[PDB]
Design a binder for this molecule. Structure first.
Ligand SMILES: N[C@@H](CCCC[NH3+])C(=O)O
Ligand SMILES: N[C@@H](CCCC[NH3+])C(=O)O
Ligand SMILES: N[C@@H](CC(=O)O)C(=O)O
Lengths: 447, 445
């Protein structure tokens, strides 16, 4: 009967926040394992340093990190002892940072970055202790065995499960355990990280390893609703959603956590509750491997202001590699493609704003357009809104009738994507229409 | 401006009888004064084979093959010796270039080699006509088809062509009928060069564009475009005029007929491209025009049966960059052309372009490389059904006027939004016919 709880950077951004999170932990007596990320902001400063910065900039980042740590220390009733550990860690970072300025590598990047999670974990244990709450510190690296793919270490499930039993379970029996997420260690001892989503990933991995009954992921959203309540107030809360559906949930990956991270939990049938740390009472949503009787339609997603790139060229006809090159170009220009539809001599795609760097004002630079125009007539359309129906049995080898199609009859559709998934059916409409479409589509499918 | 250009592909000049049948079509219209020809059927391939460099043994089996085709036509002539030595001469040249190839190869050498195919057929065709007391002269396109040095895919210099055409081609056309080669050209430095697949059709267009031709006739193996495949819905009517933009989006136009890219010079210069059948000129054809009058919401529906649907699933493509870049890379490397593509959040489904690929397209080798980063699922026997038309898409979207059309059917995949002229989807084979027949009935019949 072990529950694992995970908190992201904001939940542990500072003193006040950490208490707030403690409040939530203590709330449930079954949570005995807590996985934390680095205090908000920290990981980024650490990565900036790991790149190697000249002394000046190097310390602006360093001090930044310090300021964050002490803002939490100072509020403790006995900052003395703790301050020591942090001071020690902070100095270590300063040196490694000096090193980075001379020699860099993914491996060194990991050891550096990892300190972020070590500090917050240490501090969080003090906050709880300061509440006459028995809680100990634990180094996940004692259990999180990964390969040496520094930056994106692959967890060794078997090892993890074993080591977890040898060192983690015993401590959990003594009581509450507070540990880091996102980090791990390779066989040869070097520190490693698990890439974006790491902490969420960890909470699942540890959960899988300890046959936990459930895993709570505290985010900035009360869970998923049938639709954006800001659009249709009648929007009801979805209690249980299937993994397969959640993954296809647009506003889930974007506004919530990444589906890949929960895989260890789902594959081991351990419910993942997704709630909001800024409002625990509101309840949340359970992401399960399978749900009792899955509805034909489970929810409508809305992603507004999507840019439609249409690529036209008689030369793609019967040619090999035209797209191989176009997407190559797109990748090189730091862009993630979301939707894609094709005609005989033309292809239209939308930019994935979430997986594309916000470095600038517009994703489509004349640089990219020139590279593209070089092999097709580029036409652009912005202000389109993506509307998506997440559900079940929306597609079958024998096709699907109007049961699934008639739903989109009353609207002017500019693009349709259907067939890829039996859980998703999305299309594009002009922004102006976006809300009426959603409101009407919801009314007849859920209201 | 009453200059009409006519082009005939390899089949139309495959042998003697064929060439005469083509001539019959030429003389059919008194306005055709320029005739663009491909090499006789088979030849171009043997030439390419040779250009690769073959050991003496195989090198001559292809060599001899080429010869046998040329003489099959020579022997049927009344006064053969009037051109026997020219062929003989060209054939010898080929034999040595071929020996050379076996030692040193390059696109450049490959063009000079293959070009001989068109040189021969054109020379023979001219004798067929003269043997008919028909005044017709031979002309080397290369005196006017100026291109860059991109051997294998030379880019025509329109300006140059337009100029040179006036200086050397127009003058000859005035004297009477002119028979010239297609697919080949020459670069500034004099080297022979080719225009890539479709070349002959491409030439017919460029020459037409350069001579302000009133029309261009491309004789193929189909009597033109119909509302649907006649073998599916007999009520299928023949389409007189089709807009280029529409034609390009016709699945079966590119497949059977010819490639849209090739007609570009014609369309951009508003020169109607008549597409008919050489195996039956009576049946009439279709006019591919830049624009037409009262373009219909629906112009026709196409059917491409037995398509293979490849579905790629992987939670890791979500928010990742380059997932597709790699997938398509792999696909290219394995000589596969992707036709249709549709996406969901964590999966992508595409169909293989049977025409631009080529025992089985999906080898365990490719599936291995692909499985490496996603769950591959395969479905074959699907039929592509496409609606070709106009205004099928707009910035503000389209209502049920265009959608209601496919309500009555069980659809397995839909692609819409890329083009305002096309709307296609997939359905299982079994359904294919009924779908087409019913769709046809309420849209055309
Ligand atoms: N974003 C991925 C493709 C995702 C396709 C499915 N929506 C890429 O840029 O390669
Ligand atoms: N056949 C091209 C893409 C064309 C897509 C639209 N018909 C390729 O596989 O690179
Ligand atoms: N801290 C890691 C993992 C996580 O936040 O879940 C990251 O920045 O991606």
């Amino acid at each position: 009967e072990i529950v694992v709880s995970k908190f992201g950077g904001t939940s542990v951004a500072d003193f006040d926040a950490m208490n707030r999170s403690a409040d939530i932990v203590l709330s449930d007596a079954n949570v005995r394992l807590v996985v934390l990320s680095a205090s908000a902001g920290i990981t980024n400063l650490l990565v900036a340093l790991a790149e190697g910065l000249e002394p000046g900039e190097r310390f602006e980042k360093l001090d930044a990190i310090r300021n964050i740590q002490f803002a939490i220390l100072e509020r403790l009733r006995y900052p003395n002892v703790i301050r020591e550990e942090i001071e020690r860690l902070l100095e270590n970072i300063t040196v490694l940072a000096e090193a980075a300025a001379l020699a860099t590598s993914p491996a060194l990047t990991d050891e550096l970055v990892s300190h972020g999670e070590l500090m917050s974990t240490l501090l969080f244990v003090e906050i709880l202790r300061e509440r006459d709450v028995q809680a100990q510190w634990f180094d996940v690296r004692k259990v999180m065995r990964t390969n040496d793919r520094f930056g994106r270490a692959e967890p060794d499930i078997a090892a993890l499960a074993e080591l977890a039993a040898l060192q983690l379970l015993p401590r959990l029996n003594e009581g509450l355990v507070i540990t880091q997420g996102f980090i791990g260690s390779e066989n040869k001892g070097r520190t490693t990280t698990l890439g974006r989503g790491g902490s969420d990933y960890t909470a699942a991995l540890l959960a899988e390893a300890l046959h936990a009954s459930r895993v709570d992921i505290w985010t900035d959203v009360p869970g998923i609703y049938t639709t954006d309540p800001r659009v249709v107030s009648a929007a009801k809360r979805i209690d249980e959603i299937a993994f397969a559906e959640a993954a296809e949930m647009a506003t889930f990956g974007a506004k919530v956590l990444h589906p890949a991270t929960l895989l260890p939990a789902v594959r081991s049938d351990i419910p993942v509750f997704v709630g909001s740390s800024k409002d625990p009472r509101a309840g949340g949503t359970l992401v399960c491997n399978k749900t009792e009787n899955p509805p034909l339609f489970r929810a409508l997603a809305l992603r507004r202001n999507q840019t439609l790139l249409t690529l036209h060229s008689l030369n793609m006809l019967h040619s090999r590699g035209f797209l191989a090159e176009v997407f190559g170009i797109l990748a090189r220009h730091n862009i993630s493609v979301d939707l894609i539809t094709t005609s005989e001599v033309s292809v239209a795609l939308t930019l994935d704003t979430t997986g594309s760097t916000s470095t600038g004002d517009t994703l489509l630079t004349q640089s990219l357009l020139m590279e593209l125009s070089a092999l097709c007539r580029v036409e652009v359309e912005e202000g389109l809104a993506l509307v998506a129906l997440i559900g079940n049995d929306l597609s079958k080898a024998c096709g699907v009738g109007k049961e699934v199609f008639g739903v989109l009859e009353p609207f002017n559709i500019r693009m349709i994507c259907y067939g890829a998934s039996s859980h998703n059916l999305c299309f594009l409409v002009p922004g102006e229409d976006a809300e009426q479409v959603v409101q009407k589509l919801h009314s007849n499918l859920f209201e």
